[PDB]
């Protein structure tokens, strides 16, 4: 099926998912000089103080920390969003070396990794119905650079040894996503898509300007994961990022002057 290699990677996805060549695909390069400050944007509200993580899973493309989204507990609102969006999962994209890994780029700059906190619009009842709507999803994207360690990430890092290969999953309760956020909530925002197949165009992207720093040891543990299942030839899970796509007729707004 689909993946990140020469024969099933991003340049091949359009064959099974022709939306891959659509009009609002993600990620994109963020040209910081053509993004315009929008004063009509309300402050962004990230309310994670009562998030309930459940499980961590290696799906063969990344690892997902999945949350209990059956009540309003961890919500994104404000900024470009109408109403309330509920956190369902987070995951990362990363490279084989620190010089690549992010999906969005900033004036063509690639970061070592990118965190995606995935939320669905509560007006649509749940995730499955939300991905049938052009405003069904909001993804909060956070860049990762290599430097000082991020303490709030270590609990994720230390569990990866238990989910090395595709299909493995583990209990993962009481993880606090607030420990993954940078100081500033300055952001860019634009309408786009899921960056993995089915590549559905239902996402309001909110990409934070300030990256978080993680240590080399932490990202190296990310790179010890496997794309393959147990008992198959080992393919290290690295470079699971889609390259930037045509902006076409879209405007990126800045939340800051
Ligand atoms: N990186 S990121 O952006 O943050 C990011 C990226 C991704 C995510 C994420 O959530 N991914 C998970 C994706 C969830 O979406 C799934 C939506 C699925 C929609 O339904 C598919 C239904 C398929 N059925 C069809 C459809 C059309 C035609 C046919 C059929 C079908 O069956 N047949 C026959 C029938 C019977 C049989 O017996 N044989 C056959 O052939 C057909 O003729 C989150 C964040
Ligand atoms: Zn993603």
UniProtKB/Swiss-Prot annotation:
GO biological process: angiotensin-activated signaling pathway; carbon dioxide transport; morphogenesis of an epithelium; neuron cellular homeostasis; positive regulation of cellular pH reduction; positive regulation of dipeptide transmembrane transport; positive regulation of synaptic transmission, GABAergic; regulation of chloride transport
Site, Fine-tunes the proton-transfer properties of H-64: residue positions: 4, 59, 64
Alphabetical list of Gene3D superfamilies matching this protein: Alpha carbonic anhydrase (3.10.200.10)
PROSITE patterns: ALPHA_CA_1 (PS00162), ALPHA_CA_2 (PS51144)
Effect of residue 61 to A: Reduced CO(2) hydrase activity, rescued by 4-methylimidazole (4-MI). Reduced proton transfer. Enhanced proton transfer. Enhanced proton transfer capacity
Substitution effect: residue 62 to S: 2-fold decrease in enzyme efficiency, as determined by kcat/KM ratio, and efficiently inhibited by chlorzolamide
SMART domains per the UniProt record, alphabetical: Carb_anhydrase
Impact noted for substituting residue 91 to Y: In OPTB3; partial loss of activity
Active site: 61 (proton donor/acceptor)
SUPFAM superfamilies given in the database record: Carbonic anhydrase
Main location: cytoplasm
Outcome when changing residue 118 to K/R: Strongly reduced CO(2) hydrase and p-nitrophenyl acetate esterase activities
Annotated disease: Osteopetrosis, autosomal recessive 3: A rare genetic disease characterized by abnormally dense bone, due to defective resorption of immature bone. Osteopetrosis occurs in two forms: a severe autosomal recessive form occurring in utero, infancy, or childhood, and a benign autosomal dominant form occurring in adolescence or adulthood. Recessive osteopetrosis commonly manifests in early infancy with macrocephaly, feeding difficulties, evolving blindness and deafness, bone marrow failure, severe anemia, and hepatosplenomegaly.
Function: Catalyzes the reversible hydration of carbon dioxide. Can also hydrate cyanamide to urea. Stimulates the chloride-bicarbonate exchange activity of SLC26A6. Essential for bone resorption and osteoclast differentiation. Involved in the regulation of fluid secretion into the anterior chamber of the eye. Contributes to intracellular pH regulation in the duodenal upper villous epithelium during proton-coupled peptide absorption.
Other comment: Target of drugs used in treatments against glaucoma disorder and breast cancer.
Name used for this protein in its record: Carbonic anhydrase 2
Species, as recorded: Homo sapiens
Lineage of producing organism: Eukaryota, Metazoa, Chordata, Craniata, Vertebrata
Name of the encoding gene: CA2
């Amino acid at each position: 099926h689909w993946g990140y290699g020469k024969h099933n990677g991003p340049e091949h996805w359009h064959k099974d998912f022709p939306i891959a060549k659509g009009e609002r695909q993600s990620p994109v390069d963020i040209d910081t000089h053509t993004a315009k400050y929008d004063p009509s944007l309300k402050p962004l509200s990230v309310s994670y103080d009562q998030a309930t993580s459940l499980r961590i899973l290696n799906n063969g493309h990344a690892f997902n920390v999945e949350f209990d989204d059956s009540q309003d507990k961890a919500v994104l609102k404000g900024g470009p969003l109408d109403g309330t969006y509920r956190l369902i999962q987070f995951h990362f994209h990363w490279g084989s070396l620190d010089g690549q890994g992010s999906e969005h780029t900033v004036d063509k700059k690639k970061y070592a990794a990118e965190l995606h906190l995935v939320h669905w619009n509560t007006k649509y009842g749940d995730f499955g119905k939300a991905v049938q709507q052009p405003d069904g999803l909001a993804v909060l994207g956070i860049f990762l650079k290599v430097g000082s360690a991020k303490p709030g990430l270590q609990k994720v890092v230390d569990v990866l040894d238990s989910i090395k290969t595709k299909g493995k999953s583990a209990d993962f309760t009481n993880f606090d996503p607030r420990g993954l956020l940078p100081e500033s909530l300055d952001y860019w925002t634009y309408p786009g898509s899921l960056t993995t197949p089915p590549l559905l165009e239902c996402v309001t992207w909110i990409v934070l300007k300030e990256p978080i720093s993680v240590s080399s040891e932490q990202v190296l543990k990310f790179r010890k994961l496997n794309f393959n299942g147990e008992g198959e030839p080992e393919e290290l899970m690295v470079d699971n990022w889609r390259p930037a796509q045509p902006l076409k007729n879209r405007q990126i707004k800045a939340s800051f002057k």
